């Protein structure tokens with residue numbers, strides 16, 4: 227049994243109160259109030275982000291974990307935070323996002339932030355049945371949380387295969403969401419993939435304690451087992467002490483105008 231599995235079991239054990247306190251205990255988050263109001267009022271300008279993903283991607287890009295450039299593909303773009311953020315980047319030439327949409331799934335949000343004319347968000351698309359196309363920047367943010375470690379593992383495996391098909395055309399720069407990296411077979415296959423392709427695993431502090439997600443990014447050089455187990459250690463530790471306060475970071479402003 228790995229530390230992440232113990233984390234998972236302990237998480238399932240927790241009460242509603244304890245969970246409510248734990249999910250955000252000590253994490254970093256973004257004040258999305260004004261962005262929510264503006265977006266609800268139909269303000270396409272102002273530079274507001276459509277989701278929190280922008281803040282996540284930002285956190286990585288401003289640390290060299292990846293450097294977006296050229297043709298960008300956003301797999302499971304949802305509302306499209308990653309797509310717009312990437313579209314605000316100089317080296318980036320084209321952004322193509324794809325999400326599932328429909329009931330229960332996010333639809334893209336039409337906003338005119340900076341570089342909105344180079345964005346192209348396509349809903350009603352299941353990337354598992356989609357043919358890969360050559361690109362320079364491979365983004366993927368797929369991985370739905372489940373109470374079952376086995377389910378999360380299987381979902382992660384399917385995702386990793388699907389993105390394997392895309393990485394085979396060989397970017398470049400890439401950011402791939404890994405929901406469940408805390409099981410043995412997962413660390414094994416992630417080691418394997420980290421041999422075949424490059425990159426490493428990074429735990430974004432914007433991620434809530436309720437999820438063990440780490441992002442497999444290109445510009446990172448790390449050991450799988452070590453990074454994962456340290457992440458597990460942290461998420462475990464936050465389940466014992468008092469409630470650590472949240473570090474309220476500022477929301478990202480993507481400005482306006484075209485490119």
Ligand SMILES: C[S@@+](CC[C@H](N)C(=O)[O-])C[C@H]1O[C@@H](n2cnc3c(N)ncnc32)[C@H](O)[C@@H]1O
Nearest residue numbers: 277279302303304307308325326331352353367
């Ligand atoms: C966690 S959200 C991330 C959204 C985006 N990264 C952002 O920053 O706003 C993942 C989205 O991917 C979509 N999705 C999940 N599986 C998909 C699939 N197989 N094909 C296309 N989209 C999918 C879901 O609808 C979900 O809204």
